[PDB]
Short mmCIF file of C-alpha atoms in Angstrom, two decimals:
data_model
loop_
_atom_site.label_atom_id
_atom_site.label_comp_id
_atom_site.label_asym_id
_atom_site.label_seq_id
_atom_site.Cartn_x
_atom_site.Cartn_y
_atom_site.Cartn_z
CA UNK R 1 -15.56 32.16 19.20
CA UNK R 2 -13.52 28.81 19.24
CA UNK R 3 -14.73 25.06 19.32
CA UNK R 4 -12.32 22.58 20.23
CA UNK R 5 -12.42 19.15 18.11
CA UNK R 6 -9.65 16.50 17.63
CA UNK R 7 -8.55 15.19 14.31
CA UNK R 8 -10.04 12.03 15.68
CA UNK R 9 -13.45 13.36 15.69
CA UNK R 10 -14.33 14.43 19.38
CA UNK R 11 -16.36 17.65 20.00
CA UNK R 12 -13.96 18.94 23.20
CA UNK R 13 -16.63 23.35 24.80
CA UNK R 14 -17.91 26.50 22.93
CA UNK R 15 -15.58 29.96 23.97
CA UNK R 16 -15.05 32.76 22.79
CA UNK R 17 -11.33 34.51 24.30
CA UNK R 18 -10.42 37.57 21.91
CA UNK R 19 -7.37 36.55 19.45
CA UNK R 20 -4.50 34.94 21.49
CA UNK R 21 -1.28 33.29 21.64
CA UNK R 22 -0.75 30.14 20.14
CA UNK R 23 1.24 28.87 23.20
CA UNK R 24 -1.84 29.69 25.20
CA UNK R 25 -4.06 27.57 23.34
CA UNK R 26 -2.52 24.54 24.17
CA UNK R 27 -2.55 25.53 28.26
CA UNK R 28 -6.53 26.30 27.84
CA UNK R 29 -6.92 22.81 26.42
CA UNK R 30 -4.21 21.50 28.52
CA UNK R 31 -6.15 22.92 31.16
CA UNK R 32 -9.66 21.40 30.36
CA UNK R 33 -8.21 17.82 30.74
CA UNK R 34 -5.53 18.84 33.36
CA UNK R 35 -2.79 17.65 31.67
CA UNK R 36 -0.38 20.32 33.48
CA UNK R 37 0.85 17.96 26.97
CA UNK R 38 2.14 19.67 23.87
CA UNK R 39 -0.58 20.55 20.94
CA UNK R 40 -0.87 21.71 17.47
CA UNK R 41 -3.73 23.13 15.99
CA UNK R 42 -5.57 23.41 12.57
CA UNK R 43 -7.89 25.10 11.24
CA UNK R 44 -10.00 25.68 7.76
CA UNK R 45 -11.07 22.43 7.44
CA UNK R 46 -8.44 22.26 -0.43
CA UNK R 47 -7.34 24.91 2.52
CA UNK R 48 -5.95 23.14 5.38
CA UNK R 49 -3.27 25.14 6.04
CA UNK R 50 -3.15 27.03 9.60
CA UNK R 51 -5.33 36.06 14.43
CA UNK R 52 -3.15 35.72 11.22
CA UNK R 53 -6.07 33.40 9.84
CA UNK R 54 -8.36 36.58 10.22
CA UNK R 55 -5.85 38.64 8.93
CA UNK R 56 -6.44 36.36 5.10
CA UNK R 57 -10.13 37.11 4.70
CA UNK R 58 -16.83 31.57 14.72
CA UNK R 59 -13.65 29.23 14.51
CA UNK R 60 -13.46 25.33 14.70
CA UNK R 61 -9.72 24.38 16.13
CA UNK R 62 -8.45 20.98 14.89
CA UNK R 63 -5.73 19.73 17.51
CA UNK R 64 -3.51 16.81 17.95
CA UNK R 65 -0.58 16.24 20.24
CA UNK R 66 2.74 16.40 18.60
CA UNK R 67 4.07 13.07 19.96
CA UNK R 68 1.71 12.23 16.86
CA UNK R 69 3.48 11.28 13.28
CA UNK R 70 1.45 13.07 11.06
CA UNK R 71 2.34 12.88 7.00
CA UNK R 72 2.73 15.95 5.22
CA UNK R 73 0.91 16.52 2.22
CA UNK R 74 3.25 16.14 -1.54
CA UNK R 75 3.17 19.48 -3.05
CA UNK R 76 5.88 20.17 -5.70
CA UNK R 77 7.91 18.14 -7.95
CA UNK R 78 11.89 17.58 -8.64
CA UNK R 79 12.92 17.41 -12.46
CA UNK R 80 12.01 14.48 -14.34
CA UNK R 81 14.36 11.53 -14.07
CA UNK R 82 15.57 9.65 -17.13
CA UNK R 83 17.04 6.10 -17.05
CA UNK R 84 14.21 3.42 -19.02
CA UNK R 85 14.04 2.92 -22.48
CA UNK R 86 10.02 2.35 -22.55
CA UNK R 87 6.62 2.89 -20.54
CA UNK R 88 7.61 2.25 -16.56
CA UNK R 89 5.20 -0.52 -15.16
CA UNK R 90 5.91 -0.80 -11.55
CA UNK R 91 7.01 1.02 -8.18
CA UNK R 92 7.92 0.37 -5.27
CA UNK R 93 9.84 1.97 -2.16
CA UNK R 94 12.30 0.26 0.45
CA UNK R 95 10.77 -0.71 3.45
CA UNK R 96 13.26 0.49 5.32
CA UNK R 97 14.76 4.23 3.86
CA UNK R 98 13.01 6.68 1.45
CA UNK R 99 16.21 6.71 -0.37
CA UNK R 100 15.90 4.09 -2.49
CA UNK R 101 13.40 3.17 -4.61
CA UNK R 102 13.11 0.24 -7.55
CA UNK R 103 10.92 0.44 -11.28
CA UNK R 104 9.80 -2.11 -13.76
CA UNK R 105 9.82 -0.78 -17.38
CA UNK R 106 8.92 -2.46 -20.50
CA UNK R 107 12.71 -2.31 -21.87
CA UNK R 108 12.51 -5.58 -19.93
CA UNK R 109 14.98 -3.89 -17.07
CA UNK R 110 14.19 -2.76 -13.58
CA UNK R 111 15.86 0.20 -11.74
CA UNK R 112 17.41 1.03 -8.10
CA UNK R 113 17.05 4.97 -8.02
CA UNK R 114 18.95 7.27 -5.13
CA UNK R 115 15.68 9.24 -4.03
CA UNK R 116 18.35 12.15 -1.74
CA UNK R 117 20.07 13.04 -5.04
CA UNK R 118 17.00 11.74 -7.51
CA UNK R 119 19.91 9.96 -9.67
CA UNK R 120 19.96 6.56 -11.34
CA UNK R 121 22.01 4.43 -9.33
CA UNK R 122 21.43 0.99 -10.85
CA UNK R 123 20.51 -0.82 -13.93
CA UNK R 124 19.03 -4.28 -13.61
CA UNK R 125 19.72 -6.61 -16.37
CA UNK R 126 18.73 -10.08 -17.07
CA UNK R 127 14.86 -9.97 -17.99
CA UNK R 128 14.63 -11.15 -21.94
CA UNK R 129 10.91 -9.77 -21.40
CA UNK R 130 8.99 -6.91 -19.49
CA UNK R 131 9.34 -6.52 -15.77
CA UNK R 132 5.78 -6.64 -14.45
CA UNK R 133 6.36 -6.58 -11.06
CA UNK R 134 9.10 -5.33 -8.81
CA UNK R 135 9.08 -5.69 -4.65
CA UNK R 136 11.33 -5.36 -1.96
CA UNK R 137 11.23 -8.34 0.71
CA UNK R 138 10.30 -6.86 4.13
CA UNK R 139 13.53 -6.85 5.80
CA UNK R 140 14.85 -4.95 2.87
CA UNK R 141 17.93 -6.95 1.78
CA UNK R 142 16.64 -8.60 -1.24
CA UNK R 143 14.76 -7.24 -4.53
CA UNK R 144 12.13 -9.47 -6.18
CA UNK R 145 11.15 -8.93 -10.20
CA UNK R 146 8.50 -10.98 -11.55
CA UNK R 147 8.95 -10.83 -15.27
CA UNK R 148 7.02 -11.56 -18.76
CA UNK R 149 9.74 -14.45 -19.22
CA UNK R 150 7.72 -16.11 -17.02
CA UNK R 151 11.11 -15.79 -14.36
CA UNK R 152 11.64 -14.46 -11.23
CA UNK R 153 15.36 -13.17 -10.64
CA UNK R 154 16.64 -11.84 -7.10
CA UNK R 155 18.92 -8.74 -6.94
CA UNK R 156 20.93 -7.03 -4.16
CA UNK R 157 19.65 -3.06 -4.05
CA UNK R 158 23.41 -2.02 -2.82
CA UNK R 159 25.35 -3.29 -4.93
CA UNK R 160 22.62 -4.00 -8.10
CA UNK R 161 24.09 -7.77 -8.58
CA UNK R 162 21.74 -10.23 -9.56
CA UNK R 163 21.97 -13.14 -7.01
CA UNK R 164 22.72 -15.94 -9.23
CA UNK R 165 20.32 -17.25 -11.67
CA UNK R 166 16.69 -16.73 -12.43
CA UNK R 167 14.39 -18.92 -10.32
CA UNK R 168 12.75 -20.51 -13.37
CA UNK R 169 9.55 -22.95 -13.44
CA UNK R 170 6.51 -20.95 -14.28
CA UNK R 171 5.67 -21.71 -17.96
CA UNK R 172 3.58 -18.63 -17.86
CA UNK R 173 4.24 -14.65 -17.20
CA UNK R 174 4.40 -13.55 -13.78
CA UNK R 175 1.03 -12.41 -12.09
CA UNK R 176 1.62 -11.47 -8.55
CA UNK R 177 5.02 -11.68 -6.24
CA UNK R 178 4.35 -12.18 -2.35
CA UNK R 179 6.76 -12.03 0.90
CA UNK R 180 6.55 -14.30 3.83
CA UNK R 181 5.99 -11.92 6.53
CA UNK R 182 8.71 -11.43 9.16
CA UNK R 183 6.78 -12.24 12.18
CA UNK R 184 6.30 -15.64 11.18
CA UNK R 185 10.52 -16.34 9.64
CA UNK R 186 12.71 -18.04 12.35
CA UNK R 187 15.37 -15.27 13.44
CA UNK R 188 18.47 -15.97 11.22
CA UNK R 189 16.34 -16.97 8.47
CA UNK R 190 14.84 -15.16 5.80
CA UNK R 191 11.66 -14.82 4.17
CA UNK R 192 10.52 -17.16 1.75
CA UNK R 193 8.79 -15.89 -1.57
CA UNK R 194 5.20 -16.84 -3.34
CA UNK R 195 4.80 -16.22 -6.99
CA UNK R 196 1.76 -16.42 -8.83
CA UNK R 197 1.56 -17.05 -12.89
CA UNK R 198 -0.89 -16.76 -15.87
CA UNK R 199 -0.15 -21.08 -16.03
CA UNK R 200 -2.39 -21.25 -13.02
CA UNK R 201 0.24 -22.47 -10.84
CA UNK R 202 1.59 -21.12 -6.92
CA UNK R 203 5.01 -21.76 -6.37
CA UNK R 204 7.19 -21.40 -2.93
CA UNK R 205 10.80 -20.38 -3.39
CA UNK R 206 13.59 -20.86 -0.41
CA UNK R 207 15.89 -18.00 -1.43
CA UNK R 208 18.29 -19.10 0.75
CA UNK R 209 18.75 -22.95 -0.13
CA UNK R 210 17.66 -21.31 -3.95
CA UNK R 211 14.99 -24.38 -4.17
CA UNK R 212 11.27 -24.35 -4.99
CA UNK R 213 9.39 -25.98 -2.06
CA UNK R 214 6.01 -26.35 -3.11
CA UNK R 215 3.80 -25.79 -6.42
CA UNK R 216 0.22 -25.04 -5.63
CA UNK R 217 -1.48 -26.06 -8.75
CA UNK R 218 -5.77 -26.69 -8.00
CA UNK R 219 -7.28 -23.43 -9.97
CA UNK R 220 -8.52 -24.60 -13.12
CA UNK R 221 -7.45 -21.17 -14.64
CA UNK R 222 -5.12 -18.42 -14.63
CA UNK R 223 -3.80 -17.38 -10.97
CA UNK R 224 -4.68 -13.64 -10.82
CA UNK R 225 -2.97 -12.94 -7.27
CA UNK R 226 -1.67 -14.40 -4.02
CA UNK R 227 -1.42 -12.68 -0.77
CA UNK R 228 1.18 -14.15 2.07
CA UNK R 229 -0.68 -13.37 5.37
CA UNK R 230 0.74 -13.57 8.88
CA UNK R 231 -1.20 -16.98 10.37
CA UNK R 232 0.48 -19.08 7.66
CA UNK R 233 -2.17 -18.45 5.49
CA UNK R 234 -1.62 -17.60 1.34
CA UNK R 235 -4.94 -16.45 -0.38
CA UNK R 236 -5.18 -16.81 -4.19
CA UNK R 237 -7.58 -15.40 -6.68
CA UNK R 238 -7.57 -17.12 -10.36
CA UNK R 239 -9.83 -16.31 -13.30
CA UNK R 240 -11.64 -19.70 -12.39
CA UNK R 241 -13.89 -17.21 -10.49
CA UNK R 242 -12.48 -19.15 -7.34
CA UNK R 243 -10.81 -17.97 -3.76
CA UNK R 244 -8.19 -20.24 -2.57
CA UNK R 245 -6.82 -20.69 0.91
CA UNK R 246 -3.25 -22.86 1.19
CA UNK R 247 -1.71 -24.22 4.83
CA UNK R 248 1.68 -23.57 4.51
CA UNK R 249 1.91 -25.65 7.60
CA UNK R 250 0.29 -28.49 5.63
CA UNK R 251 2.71 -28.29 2.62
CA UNK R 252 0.55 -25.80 0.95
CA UNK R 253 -2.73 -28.25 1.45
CA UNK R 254 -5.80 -26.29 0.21
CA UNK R 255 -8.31 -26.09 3.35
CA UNK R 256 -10.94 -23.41 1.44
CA UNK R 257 -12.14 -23.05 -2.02
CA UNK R 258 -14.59 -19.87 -2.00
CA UNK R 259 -16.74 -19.93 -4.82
CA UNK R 260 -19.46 -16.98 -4.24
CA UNK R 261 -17.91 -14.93 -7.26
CA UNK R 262 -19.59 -15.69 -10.47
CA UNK R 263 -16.79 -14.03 -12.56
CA UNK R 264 -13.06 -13.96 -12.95
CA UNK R 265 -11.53 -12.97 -9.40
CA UNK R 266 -8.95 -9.93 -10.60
CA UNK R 267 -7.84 -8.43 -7.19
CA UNK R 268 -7.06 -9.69 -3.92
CA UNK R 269 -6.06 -7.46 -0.89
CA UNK R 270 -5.43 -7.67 2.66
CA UNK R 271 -5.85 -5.56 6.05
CA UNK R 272 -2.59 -6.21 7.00
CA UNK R 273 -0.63 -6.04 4.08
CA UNK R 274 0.91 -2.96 4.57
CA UNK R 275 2.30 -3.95 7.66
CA UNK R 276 3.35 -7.67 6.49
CA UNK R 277 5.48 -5.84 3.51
CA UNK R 278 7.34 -3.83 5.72
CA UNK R 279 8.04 -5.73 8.69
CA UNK R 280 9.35 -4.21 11.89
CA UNK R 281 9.76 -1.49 10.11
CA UNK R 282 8.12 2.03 10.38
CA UNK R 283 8.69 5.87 10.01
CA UNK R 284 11.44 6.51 12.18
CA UNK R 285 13.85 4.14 10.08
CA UNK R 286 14.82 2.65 13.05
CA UNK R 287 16.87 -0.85 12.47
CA UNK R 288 16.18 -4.07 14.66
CA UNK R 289 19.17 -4.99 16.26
CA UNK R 290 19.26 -8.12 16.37
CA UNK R 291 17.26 -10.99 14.19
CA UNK R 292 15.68 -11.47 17.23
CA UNK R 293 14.49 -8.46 18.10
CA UNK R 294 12.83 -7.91 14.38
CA UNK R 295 10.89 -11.13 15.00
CA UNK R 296 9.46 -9.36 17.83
CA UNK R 297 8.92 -5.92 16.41
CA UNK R 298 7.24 -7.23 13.28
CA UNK R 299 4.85 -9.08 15.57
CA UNK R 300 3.75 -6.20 17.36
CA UNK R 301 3.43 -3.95 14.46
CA UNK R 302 0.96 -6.72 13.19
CA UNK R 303 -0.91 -7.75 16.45
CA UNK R 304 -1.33 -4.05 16.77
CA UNK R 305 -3.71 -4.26 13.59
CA UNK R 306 -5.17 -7.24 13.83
CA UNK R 307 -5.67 -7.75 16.73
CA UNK R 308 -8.53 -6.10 17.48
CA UNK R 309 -10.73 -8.13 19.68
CA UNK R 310 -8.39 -10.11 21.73
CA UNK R 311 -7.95 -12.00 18.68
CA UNK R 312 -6.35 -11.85 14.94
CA UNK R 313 -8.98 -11.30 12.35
CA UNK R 314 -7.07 -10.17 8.73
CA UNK R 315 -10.24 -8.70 6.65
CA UNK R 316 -9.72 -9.76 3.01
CA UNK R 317 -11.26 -7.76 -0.03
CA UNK R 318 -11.56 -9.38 -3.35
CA UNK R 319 -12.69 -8.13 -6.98
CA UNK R 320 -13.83 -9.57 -9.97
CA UNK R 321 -14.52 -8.01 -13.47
CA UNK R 322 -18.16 -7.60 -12.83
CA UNK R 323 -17.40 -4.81 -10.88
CA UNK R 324 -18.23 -6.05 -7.78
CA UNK R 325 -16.25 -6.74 -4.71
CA UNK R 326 -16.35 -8.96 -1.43
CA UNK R 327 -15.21 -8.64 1.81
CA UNK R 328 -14.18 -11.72 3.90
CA UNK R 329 -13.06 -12.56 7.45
CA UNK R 330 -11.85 -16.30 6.03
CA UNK R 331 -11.15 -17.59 10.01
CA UNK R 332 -14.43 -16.55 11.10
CA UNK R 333 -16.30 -17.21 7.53
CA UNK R 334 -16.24 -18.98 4.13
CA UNK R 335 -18.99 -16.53 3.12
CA UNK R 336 -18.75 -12.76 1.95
CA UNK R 337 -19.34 -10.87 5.02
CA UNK R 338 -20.60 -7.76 2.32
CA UNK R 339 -20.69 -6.82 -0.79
CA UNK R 340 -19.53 -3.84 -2.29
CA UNK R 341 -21.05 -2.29 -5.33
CA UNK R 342 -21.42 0.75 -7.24
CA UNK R 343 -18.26 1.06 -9.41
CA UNK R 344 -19.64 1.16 -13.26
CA UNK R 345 -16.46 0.23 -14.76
CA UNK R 346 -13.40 -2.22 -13.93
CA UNK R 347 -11.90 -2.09 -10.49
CA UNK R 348 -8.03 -1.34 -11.17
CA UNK R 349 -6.66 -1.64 -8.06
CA UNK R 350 -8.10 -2.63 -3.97
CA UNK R 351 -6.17 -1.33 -0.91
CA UNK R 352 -7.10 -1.22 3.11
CA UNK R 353 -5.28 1.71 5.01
CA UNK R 354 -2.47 0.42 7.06
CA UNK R 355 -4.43 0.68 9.87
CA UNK R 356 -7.22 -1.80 8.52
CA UNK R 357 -9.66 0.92 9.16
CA UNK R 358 -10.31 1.70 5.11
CA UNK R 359 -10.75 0.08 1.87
CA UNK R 360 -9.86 2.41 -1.45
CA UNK R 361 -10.87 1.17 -4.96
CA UNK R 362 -9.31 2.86 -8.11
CA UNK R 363 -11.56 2.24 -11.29
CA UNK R 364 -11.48 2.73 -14.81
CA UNK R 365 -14.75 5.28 -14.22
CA UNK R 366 -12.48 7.62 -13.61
CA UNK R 367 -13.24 7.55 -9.98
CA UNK R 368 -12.21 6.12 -6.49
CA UNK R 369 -14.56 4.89 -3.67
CA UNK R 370 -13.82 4.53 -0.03
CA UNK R 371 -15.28 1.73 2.07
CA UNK R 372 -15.19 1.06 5.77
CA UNK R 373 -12.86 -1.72 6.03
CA UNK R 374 -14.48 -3.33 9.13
CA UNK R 375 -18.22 -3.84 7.41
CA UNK R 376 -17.28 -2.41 3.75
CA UNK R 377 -20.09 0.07 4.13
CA UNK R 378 -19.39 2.67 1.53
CA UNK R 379 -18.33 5.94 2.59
CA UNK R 380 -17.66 8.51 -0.45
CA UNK R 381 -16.74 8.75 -3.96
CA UNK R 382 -13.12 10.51 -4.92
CA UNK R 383 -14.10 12.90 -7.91
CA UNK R 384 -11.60 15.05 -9.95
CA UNK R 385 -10.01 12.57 -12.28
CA UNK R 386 -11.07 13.21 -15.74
CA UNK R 387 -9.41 9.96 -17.26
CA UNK R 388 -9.18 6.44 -15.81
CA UNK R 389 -7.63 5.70 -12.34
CA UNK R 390 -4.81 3.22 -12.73
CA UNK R 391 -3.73 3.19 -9.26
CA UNK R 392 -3.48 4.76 -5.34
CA UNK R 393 -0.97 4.63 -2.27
CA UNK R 394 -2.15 5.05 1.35
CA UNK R 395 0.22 7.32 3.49
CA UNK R 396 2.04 5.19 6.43
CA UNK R 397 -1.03 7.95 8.87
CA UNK R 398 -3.95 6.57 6.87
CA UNK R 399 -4.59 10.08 6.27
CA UNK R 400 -3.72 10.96 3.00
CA UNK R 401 -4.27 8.94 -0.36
CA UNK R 402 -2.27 9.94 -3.50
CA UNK R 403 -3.76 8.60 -7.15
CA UNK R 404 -2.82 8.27 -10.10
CA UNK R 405 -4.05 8.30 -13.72
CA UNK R 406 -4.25 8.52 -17.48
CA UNK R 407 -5.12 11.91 -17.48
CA UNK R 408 -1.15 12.41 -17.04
CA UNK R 409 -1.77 14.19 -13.56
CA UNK R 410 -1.74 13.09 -9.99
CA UNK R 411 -4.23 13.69 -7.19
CA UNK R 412 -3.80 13.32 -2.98
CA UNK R 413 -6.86 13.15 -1.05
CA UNK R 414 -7.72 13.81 2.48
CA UNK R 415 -9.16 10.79 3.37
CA UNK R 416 -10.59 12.55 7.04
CA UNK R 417 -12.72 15.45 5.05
CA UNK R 418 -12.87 12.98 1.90
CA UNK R 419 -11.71 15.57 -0.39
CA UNK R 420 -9.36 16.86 -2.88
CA UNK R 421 -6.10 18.19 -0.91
CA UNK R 422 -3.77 18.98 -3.50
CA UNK R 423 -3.78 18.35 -7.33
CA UNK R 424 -0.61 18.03 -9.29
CA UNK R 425 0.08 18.19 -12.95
CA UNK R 426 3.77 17.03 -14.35
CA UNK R 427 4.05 13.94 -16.50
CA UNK R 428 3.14 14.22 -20.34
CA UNK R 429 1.40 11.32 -20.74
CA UNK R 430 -0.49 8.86 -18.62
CA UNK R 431 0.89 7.54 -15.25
CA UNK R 432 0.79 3.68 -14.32
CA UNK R 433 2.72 3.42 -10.82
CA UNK R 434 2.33 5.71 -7.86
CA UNK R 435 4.16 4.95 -4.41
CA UNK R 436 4.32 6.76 -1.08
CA UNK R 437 7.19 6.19 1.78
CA UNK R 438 6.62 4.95 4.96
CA UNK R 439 8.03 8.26 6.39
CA UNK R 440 5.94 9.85 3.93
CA UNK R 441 8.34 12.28 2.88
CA UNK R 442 8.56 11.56 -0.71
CA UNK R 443 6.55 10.31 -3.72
CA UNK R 444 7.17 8.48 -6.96
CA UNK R 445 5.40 8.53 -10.17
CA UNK R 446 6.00 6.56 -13.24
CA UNK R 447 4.04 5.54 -16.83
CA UNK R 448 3.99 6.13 -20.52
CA UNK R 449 6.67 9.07 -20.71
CA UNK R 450 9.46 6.74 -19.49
CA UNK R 451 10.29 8.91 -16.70
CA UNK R 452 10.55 8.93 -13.00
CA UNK R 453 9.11 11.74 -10.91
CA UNK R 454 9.82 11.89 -7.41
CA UNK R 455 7.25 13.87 -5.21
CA UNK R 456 7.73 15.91 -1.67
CA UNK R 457 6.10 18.10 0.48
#
């Protein structure tokens, strides 16, 4: 007997044809929906893997077209690579190849690693303190490092030169580094960048002209975060338990202070986030042509997520060290449209799925929750962890969700059955940084034993 069900979640009905050909499968349910389509189909569903199935000890048959990207699951690990001189702090893959890939370490350097041959390629110097933060700007020319020197110093990922000096003004260390997204950067130009710093200032740097252009000073505390969204929006979070809103239009003119937390704002995520850091970019690797053409691509690939209604709504999720968390539609709202609860220890780290669709939260309970993203209606709890969760990375399918934590191992989920997929042990002490590529063919793992670990299927 055989029940036909897509990975969606569509019942499509009950038969019962004596062990066939896989080929024929696809012309049955081909033939259902008279498509004469290609299919692949699953089964089992740990497990997941798919008469050879009867051959291991009725049937439920998991299919999806394969004109469908679908991320493979990280199962082994290459030798660990050596290269930093302390604890590794951040990670972070190019938005446009899984071949490259860029750390922050505590030897106050950051790293350009070649991911094909899993091989230092470059040292960054410069940093006369720890690199906190490392990202890659969405078109993928320029790396970002926001450091404890309170600087921020540019470098170019082929050749590993710094460009020029540091961008210096913060009197504070670095808190949170931020892109303008690519959709909204005239073609020829490039993207501006948004720092945030424990002084409690914003600042605006033209990379280009190598010029700050505004300083948004107006939290009366620390600046936890800031988020660059695509309507020319920036979102802030500062320990003066406040949520800012800044026009760049206007100069950075503050049109929104949201004060419904009661305690120091620590996280502040986006729905479209994963698509403003990577641009036009997606799976394939595909280039834009022209300027132009990126402009347009990187509009699309954002429309396509938040536009949802005939109209742009970015969701925003924010969380404070009460342990509770907010979700926001800011255009439609100045008030928390829910309020998520249940974590019994401090919220590490707040992500939607690339698709909008989820919200994950790592804690320090040794435990990771998934929310709806839409209403923040909690779904399920992650369990397996036996030490604290430090911090997760969607795949580019929204399907799978890799984790990790002080208990020196790493963990994907499969966010569709909500379940453990595959645990792996390596590292030898606890892990800080976890990453996964946009073609979601490899992984990267960094923390306390000063070593990179690259991840694949």
């Amino acid at each position: 007997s055989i029940k036909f069900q897509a990975l969606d979640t569509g019942d499509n009905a009950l038969r019962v044809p004596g062990a066939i050909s896989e080929k024929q499968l696809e012309e049955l349910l081909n033939q259902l929906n008279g498509t004469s389509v290609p299919y692949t189909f699953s089964c089992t569903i740990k497990a997941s893997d798919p008469y050879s199935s009867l051959i291991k000890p009725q049937i439920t048959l998991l299919y999806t077209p394969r004109a469908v990207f679908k991320v493979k699951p990280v199962t082994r690990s290459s030798s660990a690579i050596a290269g930093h001189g302390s604890t590794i702090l951040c990670s972070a893959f190019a938005p446009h190849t899984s071949s490259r890939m860029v750390t922050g370490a505590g030897d106050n350097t950051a790293r350009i690693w070649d991911c094909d041959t899993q091989t230092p390629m470059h040292t960054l110097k410069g940093h006369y303190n720890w690199v906190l933060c490392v990202s890659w700007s969405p078109d993928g020319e320029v790396i970002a490092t926001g450091s404890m020197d309170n600087t921020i110093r540019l470098w170019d990922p082929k050749s590993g030169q710094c460009l020029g000096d540091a961008l210096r003004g913060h009197s504070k260390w670095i808190t949170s580094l931020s892109w303008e997204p690519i959709h909204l950067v005239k073609p020829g130009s490039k993207p501006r960048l948004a720092s945030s710093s424990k002084d409690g200032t914003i600042k605006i740097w033209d990379t280009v002209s190598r010029v700050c252009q505004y300083t948004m000073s107006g939290h009366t505390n620390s600046v936890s975060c800031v988020k660059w969204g695509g309507q020319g929006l920036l979102y802030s979070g500062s320990h003066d338990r406040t949520v800012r809103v800044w026009d760049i239009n206007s100069q950075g003119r503050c049109i929104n202070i949201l004060k419904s937390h009661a305690h120091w704002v620590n996280h502040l995520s986006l729905s479209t986030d994963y698509a403003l850091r990577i641009g036009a970019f997606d799976h394939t690797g595909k280039k834009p042509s022209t300027p132009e053409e990126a402009q347009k691509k990187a509009l699309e690939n954002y429309e396509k997520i938040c536009k949802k209604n005939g109209n742009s709504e970015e969701m925003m999720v924010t969380a404070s060290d009460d342990y509770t968390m907010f979700l926001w539609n800011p255009l439609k709202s100045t008030k928390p449209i829910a309020r998520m609860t249940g974590h019994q220890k401090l919220v590490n780290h707040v992500a939607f799925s690339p698709d909008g669709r989820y919200i994950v939260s790592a804690s320090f309970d040794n435990s990771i929750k998934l929310w709806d993203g839409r209403d923040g209606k909690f779904i399920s709890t992650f369990r397996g962890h036996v030490a604290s969760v430090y911090q997760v990375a969607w795949s580019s399918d929204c399907r799978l969700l890799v984790s990790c934590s002080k208990d020196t191992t790493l963990k994907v989920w499969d966010v569709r059955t909500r379940k453990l997929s595959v645990d792996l042990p390596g590292h030898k002490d606890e892990v800080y940084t976890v990453d996964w590529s946009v073609d979601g063919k490899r992984v990267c793992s960094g923390g306390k034993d000063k070593m990179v670990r690259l991840w694949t299927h």
